[PDB]
């Protein structure tokens with residue numbers, strides 16, 4: 469069967485911690501006052517929750533209320549514990565309170581207010597400098613959560629809230645996030661199609677923080693090349709074929725050979741034979757001002773089949789692509 473894998477950084481962060489930190493099942497939720505918050509308008513409804521703009525009437529400050537659909541027990545306590553563990557971290561959305569919603573009878577997470585604009589609204593119109601600036605801000609959030617033993621598992625433009633006027637960013641929606649435990653097998657039904665790493669697409673369960681770095685690479689490629697999404701799969705199978713048309717099939721077969729993965733036979737009729745394309749193939753007159761040799765070298769080091777080979781968040785922050793960003 470498949471060969472095991474371990475994260476190359478922050479491997480044992482949870483192993484050393486007391487069970488209070490990662491044993492989310494045993495966590496006792498401290499309930500706040502639901503009457504402190506007045507719902508103003510519905511912002512959206514996802515598969516697991518309904519999000520509202522609200523006002524905290526105790527300070528007249530705007531907040532965001534996420535009312536969880538009754539789905540699915542353990543998933544609720546996991547999100548709460550992850551949010552509390554990460555509270556105060558750089559560019560991590562701040563959980564202000566947890567109240568019981570009087571109508572749904574489910575937990576309602578109250579977050580600090582962020583502008584009602586996600587990164588998908590802005591990321592195709594940024595300058596070269598702003599792509600570098602906001603990528604560096606996202607990396608601060610990812611290194612913080614990975615250093616805290618947590619993988620986000622749903623990095624995508626909709627999960628980055630941005631206040632462009634104020635040049636501030638927050639990584640949101642920790643509902644798919646999980647504690648990394650070396651040797652643990654995880655569910656591959658995470659992340660959004662276009663941001664799923666090859667490990668998920670080939671059903672390799674012993675993945676780690678590096679999944680978030682593939683998803684970040686997909687966002688970078690979509691920004692510098694002005695191509696939304698970069699890997700445009702029709703379904704989870706064609707998603708891997710779209711990746712293989714760029715990265716090539718030989719390195720895909722080397723990845724599956726290394727981890728002793730048995731590729732779904734559904735792929736024998738659709739994968740074909742593809743050579744790796746040079747990143748310059750995606751440059752054109754409309755995106756050339758966003759592309760530099762440093763951007764392509766950085767992207768190349770994120771978009772790798774082998775999850776163990778990708779840059780970590782901290783190594784990514786060291787890359788020359790960010791030397792122009794003011795720190």
Ligand SMILES: Nc1cccc(C(=O)O)c1
Nearest residue numbers: 519532561579640641642
């Ligand atoms: N829309 C919005 C704003 C803030 C947090 C969240 C979230 O799901 O964490 C969602």
